[PDB]
Every structure is written in structure tokens, then in C-alpha cells.
């Protein structure tokens, strides 16, 4: 059944809405939410997580850093997985 | 880093990678498993679920149907999650 997938969506919503609630209106991820996320990321994983900070910042900041859209966050989920070179190109 | 975020995306991409080929974990989604999902989702043609199947098929199977690419699944993740609007923004 869809249940496992729906559970995964459930978790994703679970995470995202904590940010999006903080004025991420129209289902967005705003500058505020970004700086909070960045701060939270900037902790005890200061190589991998920082490479992820750079990748996040770059991937999301197609100028729209002010108000990045949920679909771009989804695309970033894509971009993370896409590090599986060849299989997902790179 | 190890986090609710990481766990969530991990579960999502993992369960996707399984679902893609319940037969044998393909990295892209096969018509077989799509058709399994559709049948399960129908159950007896649970109306809302059929509208859901129209949405699913239309959004997901962008010509690539025999086998469907992770990118399409990702955008489908977005499109699906969008329905959770209230919870999505929170």
C-alpha cells in the first residue's frame, strides 16, 4: 500500500512545516527560515554538514534567497540524492 | 548529519528506491511497480483515489512510463505534498 510512502511524506511535512510556519507563506522557505536552518546545520558535523550548507545555499539561492519555494526545497532533496553519480548523473 | 531531516529524506529516497523495484530494487521506477501502486491505490476504485491516480499518472509519467526517472518522482513528491497545503505550511 501507499502507507510507507505516505509515512515518508508525513515526516517530510513534519520537518518542513516547522520552518514554513515561520512566515513561509504560500508554501515557501524564507530568509528567516534559511538563517535559522543554516545556524542549526552549523554544529557538530562541521565537514559533511558544511559541504551541505554550501550545496544548500547554492542550490536554493537562484536569487530567491529571500523567499525560496517549497518546490525548490524538493528540488534540493533531488540534488542531494543526485550526488549518486552516473545513476542520477551527478 | 544524523538528524530528523536526514532520517526523513533517507526514509523517503530509500523506500522510493525499494518501491521502484519491489521485484529487485531498481534506482528508477518500473511500470510493474507503478501498476502495483495503481492497483493497490484503486482497491475497488475508491473514487478520490482514482482522482489521485489521474493526478499521479499525469504528473509522474511525463512520457517516461515504461520506466520513470527519479526527477519525475521528486516533482511528484512536491505535487503530492502540495495537497497537504495546511499541514505543509503549518
Curated annotation (Swiss-Prot), chains A, B:
A Pfam family hit = S_100
User: What subcellular compartments does it reside in?
Assistant: Nucleus envelope; Cytoplasm; Cell membrane
| PROSITE patterns registered for this protein in UniProt | EF_HAND_1, EF_HAND_2, S100_CABP
Which InterPro entries has this protein been placed in? EF-hand-dom_pair (IPR011992), EF_Hand_1_Ca_BS (IPR018247), EF_hand_dom (IPR002048), S-100A6 (IPR034118), S100/CaBP7/8-like_CS (IPR001751), S100_Ca-bd_sub (IPR013787)
Provide the binding site for Ca(2+) 2: 61, 63, 65, 67, 72
Q: Which residues carry this modification: N6-succinyllysine?
A: 47
Residues where Phosphoserine is found: 46
Keyword hit for NADP:
no
Q: How does it sit in the membrane?
A: Peripheral membrane protein
Keyword list (alphabetical) reads:
Acetylation, Calcium, Cell membrane, Cytoplasm, Membrane, Metal-binding, Nucleus, Phosphoprotein, Repeat
According to the UniProt entry, its GO molecular function terms are: calcium ion binding; calcium-dependent protein binding; S100 protein binding
GO cellular component, as recorded:
cytoplasmic side of plasma membrane; cytosol; extracellular space; nuclear envelope; perinuclear region of cytoplasm
| PANTHER family (alphabetical) | PROTEIN S100-A6 (PTHR11639:SF80), S100 CALCIUM-BINDING PROTEIN (PTHR11639)
Task: Please state what the protein is called.
Answer: Protein S100-A6
What species does this protein belong to?
Answer: Oryctolagus cuniculus
Gene symbol here is: S100A6
Amino acid at each position: 500500500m501507499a502507507s510507507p510512502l505516505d509515512q515518508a511524506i508525513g515526516l517530510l511535512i513534519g520537518i518542513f512545516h516547522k520552518y514554513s510556519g515561520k512566515e513561509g507563506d504560500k508554501h515557501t522557505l524564507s530568509k528567516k527560515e534559511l538563517k535559522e536552518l543554516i545556524q542549526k546545520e552549523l554544529t557538530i558535523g562541521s565537514k559533511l554538514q558544511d559541504a551541505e550548507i554550501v550545496k544548500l545555499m547554492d542550490d536554493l539561492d537562484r536569487n530567491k534567497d529571500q523567499e525560496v519555494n517549497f518546490q525548490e526545497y524538493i528540488t534540493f532533496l533531488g540534488a542531494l540524492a543526485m550526488i549518486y553519480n552516473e545513476a542520477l548523473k551527478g
